[PDB]
Design a protein around this ligand. Structure first.
Ligand code: SF4
Ligand code: SF4
Ligand code: FCO
Ligand code: FCO
Ligand code: SF3
Ligand code: SF3
Ligand code: F3S
Ligand code: F3S
Ligand code: MG
Ligand code: MG
Ligand code: 3NI
Ligand code: 3NI
Ligand code: O
Lengths: 273, 595, 595, 267
């Protein structure tokens, strides 16, 4: 039997789901047909309405304690939770019910991990990441796979690791798999030689831009952002933000939307600070 | 009650109520309720957007140069189109003209999104309303091959052994007892009309499309760093060009990256022509007797217009906009997003508050203040809606109207507008598609009488689905033209990608307002910004699904989703395949609709 | 003259002389001369290696740890195999045992090379000896589709419209009048026996193979940095493994890289079984009446043996080695590369000098001293050879012999040795291939009598070509097993990739000698090293094409190339299709042969 | 009419030809069918011997001054040139004859550019790179595209540039296209942060190796090697030597085989 996976969607933009199907290896088609059993996912599922809600009830009982609960997006606490309604009820109630009997949770993306864009000031819906919603008493692992969205092969890499090696990957203090989130962008950035030489893009499309100089002065948040973008890179290893000429905006880090303007320079650069 | 709408519908909620929540195979969260009469014909339809995040509120006080990244995250399906609308809005406010290569690269990214979004929509979201994968298990692989060769003679992948191998895989999946996404599908509903062979061909192409789709977005990764959510900037594109100079290998765009883009464009064109367009035409032929779902498309359609052959000259738009009203295709009303009497949003049936709720607000004057409040006729409670009260506030989607008219937006609206304005590429696509449709119909029914009525043909759920596929093909051809123009510009000495004259806020006026429009995959998108002293004073989005998924307005006009369901018979109201098929044909993006 | 060789050939140079220089569609530079009798039957054959670089000389005095990179550049076609032989030779000399994952990754790289090399050889070097692209233009696309479906039912790419589109492209190419690689091809020669439909199918697969081949070598890029010329090292592999630890994303081998390798392996397996193997079987059947070119293959074959299921245990070799002599398949003579009475190289007919040229030198005692000197019976001059004098020195290739015997090496030799030693996988491949061959023959000729004689079937140019394809398929299966073992090792806690105990030369003996063997794509490869005081004292390579392309020895025994041509009738001696077909079936690598 | 290309092979290992067909974009099939006319190439030609020789004669005459002469490998001067024999004659004679009437020459790879492995001490064949063989008086461009082999997309990128933009790309003082050869590996190396922090692989498969630390101390020649390996990378952008854990050996630089052990530090 293939590992049961319930993929819930709260307040979200669906970018993590989209990223997942970009995976070059394994292909999403093979993940779904041969590796996991994607038992619920409002994005791709044939069933709607009452027929869809029947699956949640059935999987919860039949596979009690044995399904992985993947969560994209997050629960709002304002509007009595009814800024995200599923089956006529707050999404938060769906999330809680399914979390109760999960084997483990995967928090896909910055929404589920931290809050992402809806949580940026002033957070009108009181959108709350999954771990904070469930609280300190929650007794199953929550694997945070942050990024807006995460890299496709990182998402499928977490799943294949669990299926191949029969354990949760080692997590850092923030719950992120060391597999992918244990270096900063700037710790493995091919433009670092330019940073070191004080060779920067000073204005868009200047001499430096056309030579691929460092993007620190135009707002690159690579110095403070832990992710695999400069190592695994994006879309089958085709590019990453910095390669294509825009600084990292910090999109996998807790609170990145309110850290400062994306064109503000990154902080804590000096050891004598 | 029986409500006689000004747009000529009779909304009657006396019949049996059917509730669909969640509506799946969309982006985001929707609820739909209908009433059916004694003959199982829909006589009332209620569109409820069931999420809201408040991007318009979140943007306040921030730097206009940062806006594109916030609003991009309105949606990861139509990823990039909000960033494009944002940079255009800021550039409009601040009187910024971008270099031609920035124009072209943004249009290349836009057309990449159109192709990717349309393909994934049709296969991964829509197809299961037309295709029965369980029935595919009954197909003869040789007959499936024969059908494939007729449907798309150029597509190489037609071996009977290949179709048999696909069938074995789906059989193994079914035999496992872990049915995944197929579980509880309405597979015994006679609303499914494909032969087993057509079902197997379509399942095969769902898999081919899932494999293909990750390739085309590599164009976004090259120009924009990543997909989903590629990078943009005010004043240009960040992907600086250096073909032949010092450190070219380290530039975002060099000879190798250009060669990669060429290869990706051609692969997309081939998939559009050999797989996607032929499938939609052939599936339409199987459903030739199911012409429901036209709704407003027959009467009131709108787009802002896009893809000018000459940058900044809308008379050259390759998908020209305007509004057709009351079914008069001979009269294109000009649409001006700056005119406060044209685009207005009402909230009387939405979960928002205005100081004066009789008013429709043009988006420069828009207000987004949440007001989640259920009508006193609601069945259920505040946190448990059993049957929503559509006589009161029933959606997180605002109600946009154009000069007080409810309109449909989307590829079908654009195709009508382009056909009516004599765009020869589109006229040729429409007429050749009708001829092909009629040819496949005759394969299926040798006594078929050709369809000739273009309004009946286009103005349907089938037509809406077809227009999306045709638009994908058109975008692939246009993208190749854009690429060739980019190479020409570079060859002629222009590698420039950004204008920075107005990058610094000290160069801005103290007060400015701007609007940016986009022909987004689902229809007419615009963002309206008001800037004060370097900061965002108001930022209001009206997005395609806001138009289509709109609740009723103060006069009682129904929007495109509700209109499209009216008068549709259901084989089995409790297995609402027809409702899903029609709603899905609008490609609802609910995160977009509500933002 | 008429020379009666001890290996039972009668070399007669009295008939008409035909010179082929350059021999094209090989790696590197070769000249071949033949004599034909009055019946156009070859009665003499002369193999001349027409290049030398001197790697053995260049290596003297260098660090054994650097050697692999120098010798890798012996060849860019069999890229990697010399690096593998080199690190094995040094590890042998210094008694270095490598970690299991290093053994496995090296074998995965080796099998990647086998698959790439064999596929590109058959399609891009060999096929034009069997396939007439001009005749392809006459094919019926529907009939081509039917043939394709019979040849390989599982291959998806069979649409008549696809074959028509390929044909249109080739027609456009021909019509341009710029014929490129096809110009002056021997297309009117009756030696070409395919139907137009089989020609079109084969041309189509030539193109598919050209697109595919660049994929599989991505396994070399992952483990070895690049292809051609991946990196190796003495004591292990440089691609350190970190699946779950700090900075895993920056390690050479992590979860995402392993997933990439899995995908690439499966793509290679699919191409082997759906395209390559079926094509060789089907083309063989069209050529069922052309069973020439066996040469030494039915009598004298050798390989060192490779791919042990248990590392460092040769009794577990999945392609077991040994020597079969005088056609006795029931007696496997053990081969020991350390035994000075076994592998020896003579230079009496080669452009080299020994102090005692009567001697055959075991490679630890090998000498490479150039002596470019032409026989006094040469037609032409020192810098203009019209007809080479094969009675004297006539080649840059040395003459290797095994216990004084001339032997054939290569996939066919390994297949004979494996079959004779009861390797069930190989026996199944051989029997199933023969059955499939006979089945296709019966379709082309319903009155066909099944071939049952394995020595006649395998011992031919057809058999040599088939064995290569079967070996490719075997290597894909073995490589998957290796990958699964690598994953298992990692799962069981072993991510180690290098043993550094003997990295520093201070740890080495003052004097040491070693030998490394490889089952290279073309046959039996070994490198012999002598180390003195941390430096290379002698480094001698004996390469598969050195064996096969060998000139005569002091006793007058002919090598495999020369033997394979003897007795072959030619339709048109001046259009030497038959010679090219047979020479190419050995997959000559001339840079290898001479190094 | 597609641009005529004659691709000669001297003393070589054929790696550059192999690399060329690895090109992800454009595909080699499309280059040969649609972009250039590959009129002679010993590796792929249907015809052999006299029939092959006849083509060189024909193209040289029909397209005098209009063909691109691509050269892989190099001419030996020892053994009276007969350490590389083509059509019974020294390869050097073939090279000279074709160079006389070429529009321009592309020196593919380190063999044609500099000498590569056969030119390493003591150079038994006196293998000599193309530009040195033709001498200072040669009056057509020689575009050096070095590397052993060059990256596939670099090779096809040079060709597509010439076809698209109708000029020879700008060359550095060594004749290398600035398109690809105007940065050192170390100038765009993603392991540079580790170099900067003194985080090195000290012994194979140590902690640093498993973290992807800098390869300077195990001999990486990235600091002195101009190539696109750390930017374009290899095999459709899959990897490059350093990513996979072995230092650069300097394979695109003149004289790299005799610069010292590959495991000795760059100075
Ligand atoms: S600041 Fe950004 S661009 Fe510059 S080296 Fe660091 S991560 Fe790379
Ligand atoms: S020494 Fe080599 S590995 Fe280290 S940063 Fe430089 S190029 Fe990269
Ligand atoms: N297309 C799209 Fe998304 C919606 N609706 C936007 O804008
Ligand atoms: N295979 C191969 Fe090349 C040869 N001969 C080596 O070794
Ligand atoms: Fe991928 S749903 Fe997209 S917004 Fe930032 S993670 Fe959320
Ligand atoms: Fe590509 S032929 Fe290979 S050895 Fe170094 S470039 Fe030469
Ligand atoms: S913006 Fe996000 S995608 Fe990577 S490069 Fe920065 S963490
Ligand atoms: S060895 Fe050669 S391939 Fe590149 S990384 Fe160094 S120049
Ligand atoms: Mg809005
Ligand atoms: Mg030797
Ligand atoms: Ni959207
Ligand atoms: Ni070789
Ligand atoms: O959307």
């Amino acid at each position: 039997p293939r590992t049961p996976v319930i993929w819930l969607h709260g307040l979200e933009c669906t970018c993590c789901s989209e990223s997942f199907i970009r995976s070059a290896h394994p292909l999403a088609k093979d993940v779904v047909l041969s590796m996991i059993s994607l038992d619920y996912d409002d994005t791709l599922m044939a069933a709607s309405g009452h027929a869809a809600e029947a699956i949640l009830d059935e999987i919860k009982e039949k596979y009690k304690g044995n399904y992985i609960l993947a969560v994209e997006g997050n629960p709002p606490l304002n509007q009595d939770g009814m800024s995200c309604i599923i089956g006529g009820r707050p999404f938060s109630e769906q999330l809680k019910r399914m979390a109760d009997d999960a084997k483990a949770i995967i928090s896909w993306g910055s929404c589920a991990s931290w809050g992402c864009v809806q949580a940026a000031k002033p957070n009108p819906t009181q959108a709350t990441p999954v771990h904070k919603f469930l609280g300190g008493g929650y007794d199953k692992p929550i694997i945070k796979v942050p990024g807006c969205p995460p890299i496709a092969e990182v998402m499928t890499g977490v799943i294949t690791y669990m299926l191949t090696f029969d354990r949760i990957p080692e997590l850092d203090r923030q719950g992120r798999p060391k597999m992918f989130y244990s270096q900063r962008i700037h710790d493995k950035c091919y433009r670092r030689p330019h940073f070191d030489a004080g060779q920067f893009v000073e204005e868009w499309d200047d001499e430096g831009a056309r030579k691929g100089y460092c993007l620190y002065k135009v707002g690159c948040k690579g110095p403070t952002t832990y992710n695999a973008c400069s190592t695994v890179r994006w879309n089958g290893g085709t590019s990453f933000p910095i390669q294509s000429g825009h600084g990292c905006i910090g999109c996998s880090e807790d609170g990145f939307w309110d850290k400062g303007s994306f064109y503000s320079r990154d902080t804590e650069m000096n050891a004598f600070g | 009650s029986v409500l006689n709408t000004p747009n000529h519908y009779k909304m009657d909620n006396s019949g049996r109520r059917v509730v669909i929540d969640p509506v799946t195979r969309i982006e985001g969260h929707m609820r739909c309720e209908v009433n059916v009469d004694e003959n199982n014909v829909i006589q009332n339809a209620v569109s409820t957007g069931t999420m809201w995040r408040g991007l318009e509120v979140i943007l306040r006080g921030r730097d206009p140069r940062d806006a594109w990244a916030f609003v991009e995250r309105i949606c990861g399906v139509c990823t990039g189109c909000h960033a494009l609308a944002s940079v255009r809005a800021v550039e409009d406010a601040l009187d910024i003209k971008i270099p031609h290569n920035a124009t072209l690269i943004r249009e290349i990214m836009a057309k990449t999104l159109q192709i990717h979004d349309h393909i994934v929509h049709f296969y991964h979201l829509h197809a299961l309303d037309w295709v029965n994968p369980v029935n595919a298990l009954k197909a003869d692989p040789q007959a499936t091959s024969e059908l494939q060769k007729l449907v798309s003679p150029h597509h190489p992948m037609s071996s009977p052994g290949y179709f048999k191998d696909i069938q074995i895989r789906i059989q193994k999946f079914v035999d496992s007892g872990q049915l995944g996404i197929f579980k509880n599908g309405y597979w015994s509903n006679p609303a499914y009309k494909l032969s087993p062979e057509a079902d197997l061909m379509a399942v095969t192409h769902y898999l081919e499309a899932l494999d293909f789709q990750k390739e085309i977005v590599k164009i976004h990764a090259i120009f924009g760093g990543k997909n989903p959510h590629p990078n943009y900037m005010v004043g240009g594109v960040p992907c600086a060009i250096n073909i032949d100079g010092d450190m070219a290998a380290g530039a975002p765009i060099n000879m190798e990256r250009l060669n990669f883009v060429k290869s990706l464009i051609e692969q997309g064109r081939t998939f559009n022509t050999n797989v996607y367009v032929p499938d939609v035409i052939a599936i339409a032929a199987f459903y030739r007797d199911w012409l429901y779902g036209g709704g407003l498309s027959a009467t009131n359609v709108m787009d802002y217009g896009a893809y000018p052959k000459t940058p900044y000259d809308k008379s050259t738009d390759q998908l020209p906009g305007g509004a057709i009203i009351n079914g008069d295709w001979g009269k294109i009303h000009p649409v001006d997003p700056r005119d406060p009497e044209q685009v207005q949003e009402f909230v009387t049936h939405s979960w928002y508050k205005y100081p004066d709720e009789t008013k429709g607000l043009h988006p420069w004057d828009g207000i987004t203040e949440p007001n989640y409040e259920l009508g006193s006729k609601t069945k259920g409670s505040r946190t448990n809606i059993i049957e929503i009260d559509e006589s009161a506030k029933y959606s997180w989607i605002k109600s946009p109207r154009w000069r007080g008219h409810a309109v449909e937006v989307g590829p079908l609206a654009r195709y009508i507008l382009a056909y009516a304005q004599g765009v020869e590429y589109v006229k040729t696509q429409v007429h050749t598609s009708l001829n092909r449709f009629n040819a496949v119909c005759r394969l299926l029914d040798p006594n078929h009488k050709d369809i000739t009525d273009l309004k009946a043909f286009l103005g349907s759920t089938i037509g809406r689905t077809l227009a999306r596929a045709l638009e994908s093909e058109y975008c692939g051809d246009m993208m190749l033209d854009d690429f060739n123009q980019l190479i020409s510009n570079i060859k002629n000495g222009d590698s420039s990608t950004a204008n920075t004259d107005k990058w610094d806020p000290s160069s801005w006026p103290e007060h400015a307002k701007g609007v940016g429009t986009v022909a987004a995959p689902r229809g007419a998108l615009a963002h309206w910004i008001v800037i004060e002293k370097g900061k965002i004073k108001n930022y209001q989005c009206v997005v395609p699904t806001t138009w289509n998924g709109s609740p009723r307005d103060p006069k009682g006009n129904i929007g495109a989703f509700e209109a499209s369901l009216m008068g549709t018979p259901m084989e089995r109201p409790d297995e609402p395949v027809e409702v899903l098929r029609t709603l899905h044909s609008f490609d609802p993006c609910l995160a977009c609709s509500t933002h």
